[PDB]
């Protein structure tokens, strides 16, 4: 039996999580809450996508409900998360994806509405973080509020886990070249505390600070205090790339690194970590469900103890599919 | 003596109007009001521009005032326009540029603060409209609230005036290919009543409805009910182009049209309407102060009574310079 | 029995024609000629596409042949079209898509190699032009060299045919907003006779002259001398739009135009002319196989005799699918 | 007395070198050779620029000569560099900028035409390399063929020189995020030996291999074998950024690094290496003449021996100004 999932917020992450849930069939969506989008606008927003194309299926509105592939979905319009009746709609798990309730106390308001477990699709200050394929076996059913970290952490963590297991990362610095997001502006406009992010996204790349490489040390406890980095935001649509420059404890030629990464991508991390040797570019990874894909031909090594590794990730489809996979594993553990 | 000007709102139009005022020297800026931008952020926003480059001069903050080229400017942070003390700062004219006070009643709240005349840098439902070089001689000193129409109206009106004076436009339809603005979104996001405008600006052109060609009939009364059109919003930075397809009462070869447009651009409409015969593109008109520049080589004529005319305009610098010119003419009429 | 097709040139049009042929299954590709692309580079170029995504199927190289979905394809590397042995490979029809052999004499060199009929996927000065759904019933088996006009002609001709059949177009002018093509440059570079086309495609829109609206009069003989127009080349990837401003002989409200266009798109022109009433943008028509899709909400009418109609087209997939459909009809007529 | 300079090739580098020479006034241009551009097309190409705007001055053609600011320039159309009469035009130095004569033997053909010294504006396999402000004092008048390395080497070398002089770089890896160049394609097209570079520049970032960090070891001999790296090519117009991840022999806090970089940018490396602490983006460095500008706020340090440094560079204006400065120093050494 599939678990029943409600979604709070119909932004980019909520719509793509609903799309991934209906495409994979692992979980069932029964309720969506958004206070600023009405039903017909939800139909229009779900049906058409500039990046991932039209939805393969039927979506319509009937009797005040959103019907996707013949499945009706209840729609709520509450602005206070403590007043949403999740239990009346039958939702067992709730995906919090608005990005403003990230603490345990703020995201715990969904438990008052009748939900059982809450999954935060964002980095959290105090909720435990789980990344699929890295530390998701440490989950137990006593935990009620779960965080899934972010897209950059989900790209960096499996590759760093493989490299640290085989060669012992001593210290590393990460640079990610990121696509544009919803928090940026088309022209030069006002941004409150981040002055670089208010500049025009079409004409410039923004060197942005990120905390994903530090969160890898929270997901992998042996790498705590050994990773940090920054970001650049280039005017491109969807696909981002992580560049990790690291120092290794044991000697490692580049062919050995390629061999162990390919071996990990075949058996244990299948569907999470990818491997390729072709002359790929960014748009070759559009609508790819992998967390990260190792680029063998793009990296370079200075010597046996100082390497630079390149990994591609779709920061839209991969993260949503990992949210669905985490919910499926959580339902299986019950 | 130059007139004293206050600016309400430090958005794109307000900053570019301040830049044009300090570059041309026709008017003097003494006060700026914005409730969401503090002083140091005003210094940063005025100093750096992605489109028009760095400011040629000195800008700094001292004693709670914005000093530009040695000239101090008082800063207000009021959110209610009736409580701004324009008379204490010495501001005689006030440019309303926030885009939310466009009616006569809403924009008349600046008169309670001590201002003499208010100029709206937007289309208005009930305030009189004036376009420089077309109908600006109809202004008199009894009028207190003035509208300057928009950038597309300021591009279309002088060319339509010349063509109607020489050949008698019977009917016309306008298509403008517009650059991206601040109301658009980088990715697919929510827009309230305009569903097409919420889609991603980097990946698609939006067929948007505009009322500029109808407002030309309000500026030129003989063309009332003979012009309408639409718009496209392509992913480009700054320069837009107007394509006017019209039918003429009298026969007109294309060389005669070129001759009368060049003659008008030399003597009477100098600095407002431009003329070129070179193989120009859009970025050749970056930071151009003309209202419109007629492209001789780009247009086409089917016969002697059915022509298509092409005109370029910078919808950022040209409109701000026209606001400054209108204020200078208003001060001269006193 | 499907007809056997050879393709000369593996550029954008040749690769997309091969993709459309394998996706639809109407014709069979048996031979490809290109003097500058070797076999493994053909595999790489066919497998990956930045615009239309990865190929849904298997493509590989074996025994000096290109195997697509289990079908082997002979590869030629000749630079002279008279020396290609089309008859040895079994190719009955030949698609000439290099863009340099467009006259009847130059494209007739493929007949010496053993081909039966040659189809030019470009406008031609002397070869007869056929557009599917408009004048393709005028083809007979005595003709050997056929032209399929271009993408803009294939978008404009069915809509103009419907409007002229129902209301009598008197005169019209067309503006198309076109996506970037392979003849443009990334930065400012040298172009021989077209100085505007040598400028940077990412930063500017080029007002380009086109002959598609004049070629509509060659496809529809009653509209000869009544249509002409120009073009703009905006920095976007794939989808273009045609704006037709026309004058009608009989009175026509906009609802009547919508009714007759929807009626034509249902029955007779099904799959060629589309109809929509949704709030669509350009990326909603990516990988769409229609020749043209009428946008009901985007157009505008000044009065009963002067209208402006908007039509979307994918200038990559639609034209290739029309080439395949024309070849299927030509094979059926034998 | 200013030295007389001829330019071979009127591509991007040649036009920008001519523009920098006329803007700075250090050298005098007397002759330009290009076999594919005629005189009026040279006037059009020099007058208009999409990136750097219109030329501030007068440019025209008279008597078969290119007159810039009242200075006449002889035009040659030879395709063989041994047949260009540089001595008849009076050119003493010759800038070879076509990018196809980079060896000493191929670039020595200009000496047969009457030139004295040849400067290659590209990396060279056997000609000596000089970077202004780093090793340009090692030049002597016995040398006849000189290379100026590339834009990325000119950005990386002064910062690496300062950091190695103060703290002792042990090993380092460089990632540069580069703007698009003339060798890329607008859509997916054929590229011979570099399959990634043939993909569409507007829709994807290309991980490209570069040899600039290895050439730094040729310019600074103590860093030989300690630096290498790669590149990404994002769809942006003009400004690139270098990210250097290095390990230091002596302990260095980030404030000490900022102090020594600011001290070097003030006195010795004035005009070559810049320093800023503002919240800058890429378009803030458009038409900047510095070789590199250190970004203090964008970098990050993991500990006292492992840092990441960020430097901005205009890869068009800065390199051309360094070519002009190298020619001025070479003329002063005579």
Author numbering:
A (entry chain A), B (entry chain B), C (entry chain D), D (entry chain C): 2 to 335
Quote the study that presented this structure, word for word.
GAPDH is a critical enzyme in the glycolysis pathway, and it mainly localizes in the cytoplasm. GAPDH function is highly sensitive to the redox environment within the cell. Prolonged oxidative stress oxidizes GAPDH, which is subsequently translocated into the nucleus and initiates apoptosis.
We applied oxidative stress to genome-edited HEK293T cells and purified endogenous GAPDH from cytosol and nucleus separately after 8 and 24 h of oxidative stress. We further determined structures of cytosolic and nuclear GAPDH from oxidatively stressed cells. Interestingly, by analyzing structure of individual subunits from all GAPDH datasets, including the one without oxidative stress, we captured different conformations of the GAPDH catalytic site. In one conformation, there is a density connecting side chains of C152 and H179. Considering that this is the only conformation of the catalytic site we found in GAPDH without oxidative stress, we name it as the active subunit. In another conformation, which we only found in oxidatively damaged GAPDH, H179 is no longer connected to C152 but instead connected to N316 through a weak density and C152 has a bulky side chain density, as observed in oxidized cysteine found in other studies. Thus, this conformation likely represents the oxidatively damaged catalytic triad, in which oxidized C152 is no longer hydrogen bond with H179. By counting the numbers of two types of subunits in all structures, we observed an increase of catalytically inactive subunits in both cytoplasmic and nuclear GAPDH upon prolonged oxidative stress.
